Symmetry: D4
Subunit: 132 residues, 8 copies
């Protein structure tokens, strides 16, 4: 549990802000908040994601050490997002998979990937105390 009145905020590179808008808003369903020449800000599942116009995006990507996203308490929200990503043509870096298999902290996961190679991981933990 966390304070519902605060927001987590993250800044990531975007090579092209219109292209970032299509991914995050048009496909992923995030809400567009503020737009400037050099950045767009998003309501990203209730937290704030800011996409900064940048040339410093990763040209090649691997799972570690950078990725972000949402861990859902309710499996329905996780399943809905997976369905939405599949129907809206959103690319998956890694499809539906379990991590830490057989441990109490086992979680279901998928990774989406934005046009600037930022990795989005969405998680569901079978024991909700393991979300940290």
């Amino acid at each position: 549990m966390r304070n519902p009145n605060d927001v987590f905020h993250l800044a990531i590179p975007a090579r092209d802000l219109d292209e970032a808008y299509d991914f995050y808003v048009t496909k992923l369903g995030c809400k567009l908040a503020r737009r400037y020449p050099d950045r767009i800000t998003l309501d990203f599942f209730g937290d704030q994601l800011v996409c900064h116009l940048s040339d410093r995006w990763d040209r090649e990507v691997s799972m570690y050490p950078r990725h972000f996203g949402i861990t859902f308490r309710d499996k329905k929200h996780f399943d809905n997002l997976y369905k939405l990503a599949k129907q809206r043509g959103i690319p998956f870096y890694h499809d539906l998979s379990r991590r830490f298999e057989g441990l109490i902290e086992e979680h279901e996961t998928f990774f989406l990937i934005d046009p600037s190679n930022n990795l989005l991981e969405f998680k569901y933990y079978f024991d909700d105390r393991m979300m940290y």
Copy 2:
């Protein structure tokens, strides 16, 4: 309000896990959740931060395009954290300042810097609608 039952999660590089513990837990006051040979997981203001043991941390640091943190609804929480950082000697990348001064989306901001040059930004907006 964001869903208090979910958590945002972020992965960042840590050049040394004990050193990351010293920064995030001992000085910053986050709570330690889980430890593995290759990562530590943290309750970071109610969201999840995971520090991954990695050599791919930035040797040269600039404000953009990557940073993360919390935007506090209650200025007391923002002020408390600044005081904590100052008293406990946590390095600042950028001391207390204003961004978008005089504009509706004006916010107070300070940046901390972790031992692997990850930038933490904490914010307080004068109009709470501008948190996105």
Copy 3:
């Protein structure tokens, strides 16, 4: 309290969808959700507003019998929005005023006007029971 999990939704005419975006998102600070050739959908202070592309908008405007908006429990939210409207040059139909002055159900009010002559009223009641 109203159910925080539901949303009120309203449909109104927009003579031009880009112009409606400029008003509701760029100036008023609402968040853009979904776009179609015939409508845009908005997170309007946490409720849903849908602007429908239409020629059936009022050319001549009077206060009654149609208008909509938000009644804020916290006067700070009301004051912030007024300041936003003023600073960002959003047209007022009626500037800051009182309705039912001296009576238990007295409230502060201002009306904004969108480009298709829809009237937005924002209110604050001195006795919160009088919000209905």
Copy 4:
């Protein structure tokens, strides 16, 4: 999600306030709040609906560009309302139907119609993120 402490408010025309009371209170089950010679105010599912004595109600009606109502997170609340409308003899402008069929934003809908030809739409979205 939205602030449970605020209320959405909407003003609509009513040709006859006693007739509006019978529809909104006696049949629909909304609560009567305040009554004046020229208007009645209602607790309309936790938001505020105000029915203004007016001759400016729509003599002929079509679905667009004006209608209002509630989007329910819990399907049981949607189903209960449908059942209530059928049992209490409330007229339907459009019976139970799906809109945006096959899209992630598909929703179930029905439209009621008040005596002054105001259209009430009630919605349930199969993916709750699509409520905006």
Copy 5:
């Protein structure tokens, strides 16, 4: 906290249902829910009050052993209601006073009296633990 999803309900006698409406809805500001030939039901500060058409109302009134009302956590709500009662001319049985003065369980109190001699008591406790 009490469960916000439940309601307390009380039944009391009313010698005349229209007269009870005038008292509870028009003057006191409660909302009218349902009406039948033998009773009216009310949203009484979020709980349910039902006034039953009856000749068994007390002709002679004393403070004990029967009265009902609301104990407000926030003194502003208590003060607002007193002001409402005074401005709108609602009869008091007992004007603003203190009970258990100087003791930890001290509370401000006033009593209103309905047309069938039911006693309404509203309270505010200086120590919120003493509300039970």
Copy 6:
């Protein structure tokens, strides 16, 4: 829905305070709050019930026009209470029954009766909007 921070308070007669304690605390499971020579106060499902030492209790009782209790949103809470009353030997004035049968506002009900002939009614509505 109602403010979880306030409490409904009701005063009722008790012919004997020890006997009232046995009924409300020992059998019904309410919590004993404060005790004085002339009254006991109770945490009665999160609201406040005060039992006043009195000779003015009803020597003969009928369902109307006085009774009180709790309307539960969750049927499990209603069913649990019924089970508890049966197992703990609490007398029922009226056993499990439906009222307003076939109406949208149909509710399940039972009435318990305290030693001083005060009637407690517990309710569950099949449409939760009908709780007022």
Copy 7:
């Protein structure tokens, strides 16, 4: 936030159950829940305290390693309880004091002592993050 739907529970020795009632309910203002020959159960500030009839209570008391109580977010609750303890003559083991003075985790503290030498500590932290 901790889960408001769960309770912490603690068991402690009581040399005499009536004497424990006098302390926890009559003086401290906790609510009595259940009684058995060998124990009493209490709503202790919303958590459960159970006093077990026992001869294994400490005859000689020191601050460490055993004590319990509540840490209040709102200083008013802390101040109210101190005033209650003082006015009602509840024995203090340690009067109002500061622990970790000048440090970020500074808190106000006082200790009460029950009749079986159990130590109750109540705290208020100047930075609410330091409550853990």
Copy 8:
């Protein structure tokens, strides 16, 4: 129900703080908050547990009169904890058992035991009103 903004705090002896960390953090999954030479503090299911370096731990233990833990409203949380304790090799003083069998206040229970012989009891009540 209890205030989600406060925390219950308990102090218990630990013969060795590293050994206490392994039990409470590594095995039980509690979060490590603050560490000093003489104590560790823990986020223990949202309440605060403090383990004080001490020689005054119980060399022999019995169920009464001292133990602590959490009563879960949701059986899934209780079942998850039991599963975690079994998989992580946490010792049980008493395995899964019912107490107050056949009473309305019947509850399911298990007792874990820490290295310094402190007893942890976790409970689930079949009637949630019986949690006090």
